[PDB]
Amino acid sequence: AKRQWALEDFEIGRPLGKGKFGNVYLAREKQSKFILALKVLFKAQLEKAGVEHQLRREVEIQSHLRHPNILRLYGYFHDATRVYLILEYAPLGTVYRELQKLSKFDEQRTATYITELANALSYCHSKRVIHRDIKPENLLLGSAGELKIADFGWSVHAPSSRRAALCGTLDYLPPEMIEGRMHDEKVDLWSLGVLCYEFLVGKPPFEANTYQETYKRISRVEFTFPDFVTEGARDLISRLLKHNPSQRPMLREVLEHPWITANSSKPS
Numbered sequence: 001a002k003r004q005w006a007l008e009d010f011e012i013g014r015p016l017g018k019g020k021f022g023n024v025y026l027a028r029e030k031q032s033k034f035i036l037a038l039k040v041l042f043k044a045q046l047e048k049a050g051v052e053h054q055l056r057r058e059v060e061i062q063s064h065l066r067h068p069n070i071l072r073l074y075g076y077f078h079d080a081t082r083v084y085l086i087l088e089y090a091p092l093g094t095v096y097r098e099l100q101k102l103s104k105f106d107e108q109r110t111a112t113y114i115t116e117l118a119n120a121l122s123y124c125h126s127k128r129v130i131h132r133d134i135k136p137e138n139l140l141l142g143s144a145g146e147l148k149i150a151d152f153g154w155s156v157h158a159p160s161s162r163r164a165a166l167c168g169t170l171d172y173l174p175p176e177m178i179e180g181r182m183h184d185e186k187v188d189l190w191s192l193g194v195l196c197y198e199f200l201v202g203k204p205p206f207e208a209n210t211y212q213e214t215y216k217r218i219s220r221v222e223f224t225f226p227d228f229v230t231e232g233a234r235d236l237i238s239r240l241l242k243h244n245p246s247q248r249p250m251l252r253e254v255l256e257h258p259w260i261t262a263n264s265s266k267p268s
């Protein structure tokens with residue numbers, strides 16, 4: 001006799017954004033006045049796009065994860081024409097918007113994000129959840145500025161025009177996935193390397209003018225740092241962006257890396 005959710009349970013307020021397949025609203029649960037983000041998906045659009053499967057998979061995985069740096073799915077329900085996801089509201093919005101605003105983050109902000117991300121991924125891997133999307137546009141910020149990995153990235157339009165895709169997003173694809181090799185939890189360490197670089201620099205490390213060059217840069221691991229990137233950061237990013245997934249660090253080594261601990265001092 002779990003909770004049967006119904007639309008009637010919520011007061012809906014201002015739109016927070018348009019998705020590919022519907023909209024997200026600021027909402028309150030009526031009795032409690034608790035604030036949350038209500039995501040509405042239109043079944044006819046889900047069907048047209050062939051994405052129901054993505055939605056059942058994530059809802060299943062997501063309903064079972066509880067971690068302060070993973071955006072919580074509190075529940076879901078549907079009617080004849082709509083699916084509703086009752087999601088944690090992150091008041092500070094996306095990390096991507098904040099990176100656009102600032103162009104790049106400092107070392108403390110970056111290293112603190114990486115700690116949060118490493119903790120969340122390490123929790124995911126302990127539940128056999130692998131290959132999480134941690135692109136900036138899929139990271140939200142709580143009221144204390146804590147990072148939250150968002151659910152259901154495929155339901156939101158990719159940035160502006162900047163990101164190109166293939167079997168996923170080109171800029172974040174690891175070499176093992178583009179040389180058709182087997183892939184495992186070690187993809188998440190590659191992602192973390194790309195993200196750390198993007199945080200510090202303001203663009204991802206293999207960004208190129210064509211789509212085939214971006215691909216060659218990844219497979220060859222051709223990246224360089226702007227002069228302002230400090231040696232501890234270069235060291236971490238270089239350890240994360242190893243061509244061979246096996247030589248990528250464990251998440252615990254990321255968490256105890258001296259650059260991370262010098263710059264991420266917030267008690268976990």
Ligand SMILES: CN1CCN(C(=O)c2ccc(Nc3ncc4c(n3)-c3ccc(Cl)cc3C(c3c(F)cccc3F)=NC4)cc2)CC1
Pocket residue numbers: 016017018019023024037087088089090091092093094097137138139140150151152153154155156
């Ligand atoms: C006062 N202003 C300040 C500026 N604002 C924001 O930028 C902003 C945007 C969103 C939020 N918070 C928030 N929290 C949770 C979620 C969303 N958005 C939200 C809003 C719109 C859309 Cl389209 C998606 C999502 C996603 C979400 C997702 F499901 C996948 C990937 C990325 C996401 F943000 N998850 C749920 C807060 C501020 C608007 C309000």
